[PDB]
Amino acid sequence: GRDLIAYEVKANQRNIEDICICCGSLQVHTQHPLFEGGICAPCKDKFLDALFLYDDDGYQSYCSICCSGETLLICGNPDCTRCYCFECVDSLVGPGTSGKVHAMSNWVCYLCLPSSRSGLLQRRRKWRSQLKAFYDRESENPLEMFETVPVWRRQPVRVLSLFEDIKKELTSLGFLESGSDPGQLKHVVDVTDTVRKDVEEWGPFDLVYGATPPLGHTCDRPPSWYLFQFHRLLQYARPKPGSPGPFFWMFVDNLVLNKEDLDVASRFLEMEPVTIPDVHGGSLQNAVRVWSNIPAIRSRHWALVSEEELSLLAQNKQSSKLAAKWPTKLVKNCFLPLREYFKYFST
Amino acid sequence: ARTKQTA
Ligand SMILES: [Zn+2]
Ligand SMILES: [Zn+2]
Ligand SMILES: [Zn+2]
Numbered sequence: 001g002r003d004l005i006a007y008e009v010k011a012n013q014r015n016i017e018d019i020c021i022c023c024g025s026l027q028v029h030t031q032h033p034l035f036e037g038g039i040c041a042p043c044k045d046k047f048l049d050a051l052f053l054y055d056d057d058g059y060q061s062y063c064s065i066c067c068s069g070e071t072l073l074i075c076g077n078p079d080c081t082r083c084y085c086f087e088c089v090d091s092l093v094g095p096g097t098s099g100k101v102h103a104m105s106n107w108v109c110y111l112c113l114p115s116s117r118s119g120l121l122q123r124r125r126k127w128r129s130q131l132k133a134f135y136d137r138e139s140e141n142p143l144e145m146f147e148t149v150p151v152w153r154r155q156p157v158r159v160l161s162l163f164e165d166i167k168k169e170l171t172s173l174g175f176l177e178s179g180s181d182p183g184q185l186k187h188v189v190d191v192t193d194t195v196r197k198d199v200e201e202w203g204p205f206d207l208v209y210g211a212t213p214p215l216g217h218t219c220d221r222p223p224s225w226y227l228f229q230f231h232r233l234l235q236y237a238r239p240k241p242g243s244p245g246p247f248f249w250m251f252v253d254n255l256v257l258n259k260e261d262l263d264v265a266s267r268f269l270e271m272e273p274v275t276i277p278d279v280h281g282g283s284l285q286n287a288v289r290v291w292s293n294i295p296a297i298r299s300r301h302w303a304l305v306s307e308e309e310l311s312l313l314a315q316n317k318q319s320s321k322l323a324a325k326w327p328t329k330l331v332k333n334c335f336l337p338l339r340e341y342f343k344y345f346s347t
Numbered sequence: 348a349r350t351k352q353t354a
Contacts, residue, residue, distance in 0.1 A: 055353045057351060057353075059351060061353050069352070069353075069354075070352060071350050071351070071352045072350065072351055072352065073348040073349075073350065074348060074349045074350070074351055076348065076349070083351065101348050102348055102350065104348055107348045
């Protein structure tokens with residue numbers, strides 16, 4: 001119905017807010033987050049279905065407006081990750097724009113330029129908030145949803161990682177400067193004697209990461225321990241009640257905890273794990289169980305894996321002199337959604 | 348612009 005939408009507005013004199021700018025329908029549900037206009041049920045359920053879905057490339061996965069899986073025009077800015085759908089542009093901005101755009105060399109999306117309006121596309125007044133605001137109101141089991149952050153108010157990320165050194169990764173992700181001194185990352189291996197007072201003085205935190213030691217057991221400390229200490233420490237790390245809230249935490253397991261000692265973890269962390277596998281074309285090299293508050297991490301789950309598989313997968317590894325090489329690659333991209341909250345450092 | 352499509 002997209003070809004008709006533009007008529008409806010300049011002809012039947014409707015108010016965009018009355019046509020699902022996604023699929024140009026007339027049976028609206030509740031207005032559209034990002035741009036001026038409404039949303040149909042079938043269309044909304046999808047908007048949700050893919051909110052912070054990113055890809056190896058590093059950009060968002062679906063159309064910023066319609067959630068189309070087709071080809072997408074990407075922003076030319078490095079602060080932006082949003083991508084815009086061919087038809088969407090054309091159908092709402094004006095005809096023959098996706099042309100002009102695929103033409104342009106230095107493009108800046110709609111949620112990036114000075115002028116508020118282009119064609120019929122109208123970037124809401126202060127959307128970012130209205131977005132989350134939507135999330136809550138519209139999903140059926142809302143989760144921790146933190147308002148996003150305009151490119152100019154994005155201070156650097158302050159991280160604390162227990163047992164495992166992330167640096168290398170968040171570095172490659174564009175989260176850390178090149179200056180390895182004020183480096184907002186604190187690593188600490190032993191915390192058995194650490195008190196809430198320490199953590200507090202340790203400078204306030206934005207992200208607390210942490211994870212169990214690998215299969216190549218080098219440190220003798222009952223797995224379940226880590227789960228526990230991590231938990232503790234975290235509360236310390238948290239912020240003084242009522243403060244804004246850009247606050248994220250994650251705990252990872254390389255299949256080192258067992259059924260019991262795990263059903264535990266999930267109770268303390270308050271969320272069923274999210275096992276992420278490493279593919280090799282049919283085979284299965286490694287895997288990783290995860291816990292976190294980071295935007296949509298409960299979508300990158302591969303129910304395509306079975307317990308009885310891992311149990312064995314964890315047999316051919318304790319059967320060699322493998323290196324404690326920690327399976328980074330797995331989560332590296334999980335952190336992507338954050339690019340929308342903290343400062344990014346161009347390489 | 349720059350293009351891209353994912354599965
Ligand atoms: Zn629709
Ligand atoms: Zn942009
Ligand atoms: Zn679109």
